[PDB]
Amino acid sequence: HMNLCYIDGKFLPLEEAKLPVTDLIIQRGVGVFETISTHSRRPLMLTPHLKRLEGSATASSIVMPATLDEMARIIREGIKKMGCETMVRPYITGGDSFGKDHLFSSSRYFVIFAEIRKPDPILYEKGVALHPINAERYLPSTKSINYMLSFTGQRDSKGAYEILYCPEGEIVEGSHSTFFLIKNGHLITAPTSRALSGTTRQIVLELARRGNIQVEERCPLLTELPEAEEAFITGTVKELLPVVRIGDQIIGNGVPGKLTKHLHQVYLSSIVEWLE
Template sequence: MSICFYRGTFMPLEECRIPVTDLAIQRGVGVFDSIRTYGKNIFALKEHIERLSESAKRCGMEAEKIINELPDIIKKGVNHDSAPDGDMVVKAYITGGCINDHGHFPEPDFFVIFEEAHVLTSEELRNGVALKPIYKERPFPETKSTNYLAGYMTMRGAKPNEFEALYIVNGEITESSTSSFFLCKDGKIITAPVGKVLRGITREILITLLKENNFVVEERCPLESELSSADEAFISGSVKEILPIIKVGDQTIGNGHPGPVSQHIHKLFLSNLDRWM
């Protein structure tokens, strides 16, 4: 069963209610973070909470008290009798609350959802997926806000194999709707730098592992023009881990199949999970 923590109480998710006066509803003022568990083991909790704190500060939310409470709440929720069995995704939301003081939110609210993790299918991992390009800048890329409207609108009319949208700005690839993007080319792993993209937690862990294992990592925006000569591409995220990309728009990546580099990196990631539990 999916559960939610709100205002001091764990409850079935469908019973949770927040006020219609909350600025998350009225003006879309909200930030969140998604945290994966492997069974009851929480992946990179400290790193996710730090990023959530950064997002809240950028939005003008006075959320220090909430941030300090969240680790204990999340640990209790994961081990709650009514929590889902198996792997979970924990979504911690901080909303603007009901007071807007000229773009400053002195009384934010929060809730935490505990749901079954819907992991990638074996077919998606085996065959890879495509991304649909979106030629615009992501709003506030360094903040993990609840505003995913641009990505959702781009996916209208998407082809069956198009997994999510990929942001491309002036020929530079930044990130996809819910993931960090990596391009494998000429023996290098290329990914956009923080400042132009969200500080992906799985992205940071992958960069650490890649450098430890003598991969050459370039933190720059891959170019759209490089897609045609790339060997492989993949995206990363807390729930999806590593997912091979075989096509962007009409451009096939490599031979159109998941390659050995992304598969090796996925195995490397899985073999080091314990370091971030």
């Protein structure tokens, strides 16, 4: 498919869109972004995503270069020009300078629209492996562009789907995901003081309330995994994706569990409520 980039008021072919090297997103990694996905060409949790983008910008001392309503209009228009199920990434850059006022005042912005690349049906059927590392994301409420550790943390990884941030053996979150453990039919997930306040996570907590599943907002430990029945990771593209192995440790029987499959079926049935 011909992916798009919105930049300087125009929807360009992605492959032609360029950014000035003066921009401190290139020189110094000053940028924030979100990933927004479509179900039936409708963006899922667009407002909650645009609010998290602004909070990422504000937390990084970046003055918003457009209103949330303008970002929303561009996202909607580009989904329509794609004509397909879309992964949408709005990026807010630092721009050319950090002022004497300790603010990035000349921020740039662009929005990448790509055809959605959902996990293959077979990864929902068999589930995935995660590679644990002794590291965490600094300022976890802020989605910056720095995903260097999502990559370098692989390579001694054994074909793992994603890395899992396990600082001092405390499971916090995946490189692109909320992590859920299931122990004696309870959901266990890191509190928002340690993990990004995921849109999927918030929808999962609501489905747990509707289903009468207790949720403990604490960090599961790597040393608890032998006693777990199931595990899964969440995000707007991956939905609920079973996790059957973490490092060398198989999760219960090593195929997706009943409560993971149940919650994924409820998530898909219920999703219309959070589409815009």
